[PDB]
C-alpha cells in the first residue's frame, strides 16, 4: 500500500477515464479518453489532475496502478481574484484508509498556496451529510446557503439557438 | 453598441463595473482586486465589454461579462459565467441579450456543452432573464451546494 501522489501526464488518460467511471458508481459518462488528452494536455489545459499510483504488488485486480485522483482547475471571483476549484476527488474503496486522500488534500492545499489562491471551492450534494461533515471538519462553509447563491446552467441546445 | 473582448486598457472600466455589480450583490466592501490584478491575471479569466459610440462623464464601456473555462468529468469543457452587469441607464433590450449571444458563440467554439453560473436567491430579474433562455436551477435539480475552504484552513492542511 505504498503509494505516491503526482501530477497526471498524457500517458495517464486511460486511467483517469477509468477512475471517472469508478467515481460515477459513487452518471452518463460520455467523455472519452481522446477528450481527456486534448483537453488536458494542450497548450491551454482545461483541468489538472493529481493521481495516486501504487506499485505492482498492490495493483488492482484488473492490473492497474492508478487508484485515486483529484481533478481541479483555477477560477476567479471579482471580489478576491484567484481560487482553486476542486471538481472531483476520489479514491478507490479498497485503497482508502492508507493516507492517500489526506496526502492529496495536503498537496492541493500546497498548490493553492503556490497559486496565492484565497480559497478552494467545490460542490457537495445537499443531502450528503457525511461529505458535508468531512469538509466542515476541515473548515468548510456552505456558501450557497450562508450567502444565498444558487447554481444554474444553460445547456447546449439553448447556447446553439443564441449563437445562431 | 458593440460587444468585444476586453483589452488591457479596459481594466479601469471593468473594475468600475465590478464595483457597481458588487453593490447590487451587497458585496462592494469585498472587492479587494485592483486594476493591477486585473492586468496581471487577465493579460485566469476573460472579459467581454459592451462599448457604445458615451456616459455623461465620458465612459464608453457600459457593460461587461467575465468568464472562464471549467471542466466536468462526465461531459468535458464547460463555459463558466462569473459576472455579468449592464449599467442602469443602458438596460433596455439588446446589451444583456447580445452579451449572452456572444458568450454562446464562445461556448460553441470551445465545444462547451453547457454554461454554468451562480444567481442570488432573491434575484428574480436575473432568474427570469436566464430562465427565459432555457436555464435550469442545478441547486434544485441536482441538489448542489457551493462550499468553500478559505486560505487559513488550506494553510492548516498544507502544513499538517
Swiss-Prot record, chain B:
Binding locations of substrate: 24-25, 82, 116-118, 142
Gene Ontology terms describing biological process: angiogenesis; polyamine biosynthetic process; putrescine catabolic process; regulation of cell population proliferation; spermidine acetylation
Source organism: Homo sapiens (Human)
Binding site for acetyl-CoA: 84-86, 92-97, 123-126, 130-133
Keyword field: Acyltransferase, Cytoplasm, Transferase
Catalytic activity: an alkane-alpha,omega-diamine + acetyl-CoA = an N-acetylalkane-alpha,omega-diamine + CoA + H(+); spermidine + acetyl-CoA = N(1)-acetylspermidine + CoA + H(+); spermine + acetyl-CoA = N(1)-acetylspermine + CoA + H(+)
Purpose of the protein: Enzyme which catalyzes the acetylation of polyamines. Substrate specificity: norspermidine = spermidine >> spermine > N(1)-acetylspermine. This highly regulated enzyme allows a fine attenuation of the intracellular concentration of polyamines. Also involved in the regulation of polyamine transport out of cells. Also acts on 1,3-diaminopropane and 1,5-diaminopentane.
Record text on subunit structure and interactions: Homodimer.
Disease: Overexpression of SAT1 and the consequent putrescine accumulation might play a role in the pathogenesis of keratosis follicularis spinulosa decalvans.
Residue ranges of every copy of the N-acetyltransferase domain listed in the record: 1-160
EC number: 2.3.1.57
Major location (coarse): cytoplasm
GO cellular component terms, semicolon-separated: cytosol
Gene transcribed to yield this protein: SAT1
pH dependency: Optimum pH is 8.0.
Homology family: Belongs to the acetyltransferase family.
GO MF annotations, alphabetized: diamine N-acetyltransferase activity; identical protein binding; N-acetyltransferase activity; spermidine binding
Pfam entry (one): Acetyltransf_1
Active site: 130 (proton donor)
Protein name: Diamine acetyltransferase 1
Compartments, as annotated in UniProt: Cytoplasm, Cytosol
Pathway of action: Amine and polyamine degradation; putrescine degradation; N-acetylputrescine from putrescine: step 1/1
